[PDB]
């Protein structure tokens, strides 16, 4: 609005266009998310209603800051703090060289703090993926895009047909469970950890069943010993092929013993045993964490 001068388009999110903008009175640079408001159609999109109600409650250093909401007759603008870029872009730029291990560990540590903060305030993010993870030039990383986030004061029911990502989806959701839990966010963060480490997606599936099967070929086909209940899950089939668990040392070679132990904990099949963000933060992998800056 009148005190902002648009500088350039930076992205689309859920509901979309994001512009870099400058506050002409204070100098602050901001990211402005403009929702295109059809007032004969459906009104304010549920993605926006959720992202604003939930973001307004979450004040934390590793969650993106919503500075303001400018809400007029035909337009709705979200004003966010501006961050340099998204982890996906940084990983693409860092392919070939790879992101340094100390930076990986700092990003992981910071993300787990943002999520532990989300979960202890009954917010499930539900869509963690590198495009939703924003970095600055001073070494910080923040969770962004709360469009698909849900309050879990009451359990969150699953979407029959699910327009969340496929690559970062937890196996309990793939096997048809009834509710989400906080485990689904740990499972996605585990995928991203391994992706920074190897410089490629861990489980790049092409459909629901393909995706289940990539998970199965790396972690082993689950059974009731590992995951009590699995075989009575709605989308579970006794005809699933029986693959063996792979050594973590083949899966993520660069990683030391402590990182292999935490990753195998974030990728537990049974969402009841999968580590919580709060507990991950105690893990010895973090004892020697620093705050290196990205070469951007």
């Amino acid at each position: 609005m009148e005190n902002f001068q648009k500088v350039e388009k930076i992205g689309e999110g859920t509901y979309g266009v994001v512009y870099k903008a400058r506050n002409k009175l204070t100098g602050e640079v901001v990211a402005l998310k403009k929702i295109r408001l059809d007032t004969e159609t459906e009104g304010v999109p549920s993605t926006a209603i959720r992202e604003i109600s939930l973001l307004k409650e979450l004040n934390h250093p590793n969650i993106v800051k919503l500075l303001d909401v400018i809400h007029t007759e035909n337009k709705l603008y979200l004003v966010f703090e501006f961050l340099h870029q998204d982890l996906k872009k940084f990983m693409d730029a860092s392919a070939l060289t790879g992101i340094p291990l100390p930076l990986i560990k700092s990003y992981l540590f910071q993300l787990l703090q943002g999520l532990a903060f989300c979960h202890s305030h009954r917010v499930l993010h539900r869509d963690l993926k590198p495009q939703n993870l924003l970095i600055n030039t001073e070494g910080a990383i923040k969770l962004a895009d709360f469009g698909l986030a849900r309050a879990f004061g009451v359990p969150v029911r699953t979407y029959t047909h699910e327009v969340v990502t496929l690559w970062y989806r937890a196996p309990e959701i793939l096997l048809g469970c009834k509710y989400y839990s906080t485990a689904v966010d740990i499972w996605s963060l585990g995928c991203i950890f391994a992706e920074m480490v190897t410089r490629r997606a861990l489980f790049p599936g092409d459909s629901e069943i393909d995706q289940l099967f990539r998970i199965f070929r790396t972690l082993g086909t689950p059974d009731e010993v590992v995951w009590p209940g699995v075989t009575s899950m709605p989308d579970y089939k006794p005809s699933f092929p029986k693959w063996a668990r792979q050594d973590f040392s083949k899966v993520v070679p660069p990683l030391d013993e402590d990182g292999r132990s935490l990753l195998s904990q974030m990728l537990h099949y049974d969402p009841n045993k999968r580590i919580s963000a709060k507990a991950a933060l105690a893990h010895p992998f973090f004892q020697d964490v620093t705050k290196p800056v990205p070469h951007l």
Binding site: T39, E40, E42, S53, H119, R122, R157, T160
Partner: protein, 258 residues
Amino acid sequence: VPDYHEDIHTYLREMEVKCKPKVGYMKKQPDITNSMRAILVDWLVEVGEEYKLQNETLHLAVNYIDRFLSSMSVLRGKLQLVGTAAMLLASKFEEIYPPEVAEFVYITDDTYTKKQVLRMEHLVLKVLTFDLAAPTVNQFLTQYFLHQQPANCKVESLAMFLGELSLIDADPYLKYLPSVIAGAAFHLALYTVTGQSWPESLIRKTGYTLESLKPCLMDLHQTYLKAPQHAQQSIREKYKNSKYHGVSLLNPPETLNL
């Protein structure tokens, strides 16, 4: 089993204080009445049944309605537009796929237009300043239900039923926090079904003794007793379903031993 059952419960306790409507508000409304509120809320129960909405959506819509009427004067001929915009927003917040706006026009018998419903959406978001994630009886009940030994379907359905009845009567129920109303329903549902009482694990967690719940429990028991006679019957009819173990057919205890 979460590491945050505690943290979420404490946080919900904080938030419910901040999302509280003004208890006095109906008497500052020059054109509307506890009795019209009651008709509106009862109608929303039916809309929730007809469109197969979760119970949480109904509780959130009521919270939105009460907070909006705590700051804005509304004329009887517009109160249903408030209710419809609140139900739409609660459906957007809570439902996987909310009914289309056209459907919310149709439920009023075309008494408002689509553009009216949408402009009331905008105005409700503004008055509520986008704070939509409000704690509800339903949410406190859901947490409380973990402390059952052992878990009892009828107990849970009848606690839900009593928690919904309290939405209908501003009457007294605006006086109590959702954690206390949930406290009273859980106890009264337990007692009715099994003869047990508000469990000590819940006493320690909530810091609510059975005695501190007494004022709210006397209101709820009278409501339960009087339910079959109440001018509004939608929650009753709804809770005779087998999905809900028919609990609203059960016979309330004539006394509470309190």
